[PDB]
Design a protein around this nucleic acid. Structure first.
Ligand SMILES: [Mg+2]
Ligand SMILES: [Mg+2]
Ligand SMILES: [Mg+2]
Lengths: 121, 128
RNA sequence: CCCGGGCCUUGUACACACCGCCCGUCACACCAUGGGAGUGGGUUGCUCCAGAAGUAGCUAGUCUAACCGCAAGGGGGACGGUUACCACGGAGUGAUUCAUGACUGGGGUGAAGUCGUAACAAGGUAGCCGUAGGGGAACCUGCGGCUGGAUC
RNA sequence: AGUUGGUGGGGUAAAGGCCUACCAAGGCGACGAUCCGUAACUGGUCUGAGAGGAUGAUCAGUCACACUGGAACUGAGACACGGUCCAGACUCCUACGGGAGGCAGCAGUGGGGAAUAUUGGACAAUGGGCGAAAGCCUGAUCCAGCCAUGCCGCGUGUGUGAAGAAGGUCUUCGGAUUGUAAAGCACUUUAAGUUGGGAGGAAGGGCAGUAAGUUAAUACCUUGCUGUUUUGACGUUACCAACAGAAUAAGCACCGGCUAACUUCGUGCCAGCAGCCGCGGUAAUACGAAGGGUGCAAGCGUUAAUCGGAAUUACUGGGCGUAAAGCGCGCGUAGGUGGUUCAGCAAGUUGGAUGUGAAAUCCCCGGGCUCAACCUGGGAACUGCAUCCAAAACUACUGAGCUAGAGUACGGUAGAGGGUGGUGGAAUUUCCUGUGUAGCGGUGAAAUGCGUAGAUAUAGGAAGGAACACCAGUGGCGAAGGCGACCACCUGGACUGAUACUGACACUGAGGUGCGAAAGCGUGGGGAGCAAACAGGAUUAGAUACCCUGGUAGUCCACGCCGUAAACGAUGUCGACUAGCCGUUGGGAUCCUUGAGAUCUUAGUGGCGCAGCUAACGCGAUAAGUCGACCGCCUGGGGAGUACGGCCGCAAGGUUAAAACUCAAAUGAAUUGACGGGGGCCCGCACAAGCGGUGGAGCAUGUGGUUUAAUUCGAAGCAACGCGAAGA
RNA sequence: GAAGGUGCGCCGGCUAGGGUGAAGGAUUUACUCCGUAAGCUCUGGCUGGUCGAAGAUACCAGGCCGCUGCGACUGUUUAU
């Protein structure tokens, strides 16, 4: 606090590490699905969320949430992954963009179509 | 010890918390000169120097409605961080109501006079 | 004195309110990570070898328009040779960094399983701190210290 | 180790270890050298109230690079993108002997990626190169092609219009909402389409004439005018008129709170949503859909990233008694800061001037595109640096002083302050002897144990070790850790009174150094009691414990090491100020000279308490109040004071000290309740004293279980079981 | 001696110092001290040239490194 103590050692600012290290300062990355599975949420929640392990183009292996109702993804499927974690899913820190490359948009969606890659009918 | 001036303000400030009438303390050029600015500004009633080989400086204090006239007095140019300002950069205490005593080269004198005189200096203390 | 109840005060890590809370080992799963005989790459230090072209020095020599000249030939030059510098490449020996590695250690998270019940009330041996020894485990014991201990 | 200087020489356009010969041992570095990782730098850009933080696209200045490494040549200028030489990798041609190339120029291709465009036109303009000029080249440049990529501007119609049309949704079934919204009636038609007109970006060149200059010349040539002919890539121009018809033009996100905006239907902890709180387990404003609404609009959301909010690195502008945070404690180096008076100086400081701080951008006032975006004129600013001139309040320096801080000289006082040696008493244990006889010891009770070989007890004697009862006291001393028998010796500090002396000699203190409980470690001694480990006895479901009986290290001494504690007042040191009241230790002064108390003052040590502070508890002259100097430390919890490396250690370990991952909280104080194998008081067939019972027997009833075709259903501790059932 | 590397012959040019040492001087006291040109002798330094395939040329004269068991180590022992 002393102005002399500050002169020798200036105040230091911490730099928080990104919560999406596998994305590497890019808005989205392309990867392929190595394993499609369902997992169980934490204490409060109880469901079967669809998550897939993705091998990204920079070599990172991550698991990203598959949003929406129903998906057509299996092994060896090219997907685009976006940031944003899932709070009730441990270890999931990315989202799979529906409507790009192989992952088709959710069928029969009417509200919030752009967020889930849904065509206008 | 290492800041006789700030001893002057804190001796004044402590007395006004205790509703004392007069204070005594060893005198100096800066202490007497700052008392000159305070008296001519009206924050202190009068000050005397007891001229002896070890001179004291005595301030009698002012109260208007029981509350002391000096609501707050704060030292600025402490020995650890001496503060120097230009004429334009001189502080305005409480939007001009207060006084920021500045020791310019035309003698010790207020911030209002320093702007009029166009000279800066060491911002000693702020009064209100 | 046993049970239940009423008031005051006290301690509480409880508020689902002691039929509370809560600790640790062990069993299973997942995740990240340390150690690890090693294994595979990157970068780099030092000590040397090497020396293409080029530049400069010297001259085994060969050739030669400007200048001089008797018109012999000199002056100068070019090439060749050679030395100095030095790139590539090579040798040895280190350093560092990255990735992997049988096995091994702890850590975290888990839908909850086994063994106890260590702390929270004087938590039923007050607790905690340092240290030492011991024990399936929380822990126990000794020595010193503290109150961040109840009753009095 | 050409490393750092010197000398001579060489070399450069130029100084210089630039090179070399010799001489000397120098040079840089906690003001961070060297090394590792990253990175072009700046004007500027983003964000922010600002201070700051992040960043270095477009444009501008500098730099470096040109397939990789190196080298020179020419030239004013290069060690040269589209130049040369050599070596290397790659691609290609070959007649096998050898050759050719370098898109990080403009297009374009393959590849990588989430992702970024045409194999375009012209030198018309402005520049550049060459040329006398004409003129040529110019993928510079000027334009065009593609992309909502961004900023800006416009449109997708306007008024009227109840039938409150139909349909949808909700519904209380009345109705409401969609909704003047539609339909209809009138109306205009930006923009788009078609047609027509239409600037400016053009400066100039050629030709001919004329005038002036020049030269001996009227010739040639240069310049100024006159007339004519010619130069626009874009472009099929901006811009302006006419025709036609509402005709060619609305989608995206959200509606639980934060946050503007709600119902129904389907689902039912499944499906799913989700930035956080969280929603969904059968009547969901939070999931999916519908209607309605909300916000935005040729855009709308999501992601990625920066700043802000975040005062959450606090200079502006935070904290450290208990929430994270005062080093265990001294001394002290660098540094930081320093009492008071006079004079000088002018580095800081202040004002002014000058030069510079490139242009663009930011900002202010204007101008031109129909406005805006955009362009542009001028100004402001660039908070900086350098020089000069003035000033001397403060800081720095210099010179001279002063005693208020600091210190020295003297007498005295108290003290478990420290070290070295002796000495004493009480007690324990062990051993010897006498008396004396069935227990002693221990516990909740026992047992292990000791004892008839005579224990315990009692008396006499001896040895040995450890600690010093009473005094004893929020008493004393010490920097802290700590220090309690007495005496002798050696020795430090504090307190106290006056006088005398020095005269700021001070404070703090990163590194550094010294001391530092207990445990522990090494060598040697010593060993009475106690007692980790260990053994046995109990308790217990178990008891590696609590309890008992023994008992080793250790505790003790000397010399070394360790270097840690809840090393705490959980409160760094130093200085000053701010009501009081009641104790106590060592002094001093005055009344009391009192015999024996009282009043001031000082250094400590305690308890209340005004103000003030505090989140509260509480602190409150021994501050956590008001300040000042310096230092140390903190930035959510766990991981973790752990791993790795370094230093230290004989070791145990200490010290310095992360990250991945993971959680949305951990935390402090205080309040209400509840609880306690906490305390105080009181009551009830609760206990105590008795009366008679159940549980043993036979019968009645109900329940569980079993069985059945059903043994109908419910009631499930007290508070269900002769209950609903007051009667199959 | 970890490992590993460089130089090394001969002949010149320049150059730095040991020792000894008539002189001379001193103590011209004496088996005295200081010192000394030349001459002998020893150790270097910096350069140039030169021959050979090769210069520590013969004889002479360590091979080295990594992991691991055992014994700490020098030593002693079954004369055969
Ligand atoms: Mg073996
Ligand atoms: Mg041996
Ligand atoms: Mg034999």
């Amino acid at each position: 606090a002393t102005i002399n103590q500050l002169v020798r050692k200036p105040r230091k600012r911490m730099v928080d590490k990104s919560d999406v290290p596998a994305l590497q300062n890019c808005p989205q990355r392309r990867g392929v699905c190595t394993r499609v599975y369902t997992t169980t949420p934490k204490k409060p929640n109880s469901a079967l969320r669809k998550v897939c392990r993705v091998r990204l183009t920079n070599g990172f292996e991550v698991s990203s949430y598959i949003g929406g109702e129903g998906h057509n993804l299996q092994e060896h499927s090219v997907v685009l992954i976006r940031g944003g974690r899932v709070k009730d899913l441990p270890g999931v820190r990315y989202h799979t963009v529906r409507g790009s490359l192989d992952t088709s948009g959710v069928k029969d969606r009417k509200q919030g179509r752009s967020k889930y890659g849904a065509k206008r009918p | 010890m290492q800041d006789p001036l700030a001893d002057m303000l804190t001796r004044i400030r402590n007395a006004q918390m205790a509703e004392k009438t007069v204070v005594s303390m060893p005198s100096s050029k800066l202490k007497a000169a700052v008392a000159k600015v305070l008296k001519d500004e009206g924050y202190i009633a009068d000050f005397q120097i007891s001229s002896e080989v070890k001179p004291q400086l005595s301030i009698e204090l002012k109260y208007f409605e029981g509350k002391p006239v000096i609501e707050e007095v704060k030292r600025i140019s402490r020995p650890g961080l001496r503060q120097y300002k230009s004429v334009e950069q001189l502080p305005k205490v409480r939007g001009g109501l207060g006084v920021s005593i500045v020791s310019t080269n035309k003698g010790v004198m207020t911030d209002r006079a320093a702007r009029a005189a166009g000279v800066g200096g060491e911002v000693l203390c702020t009064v209100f």
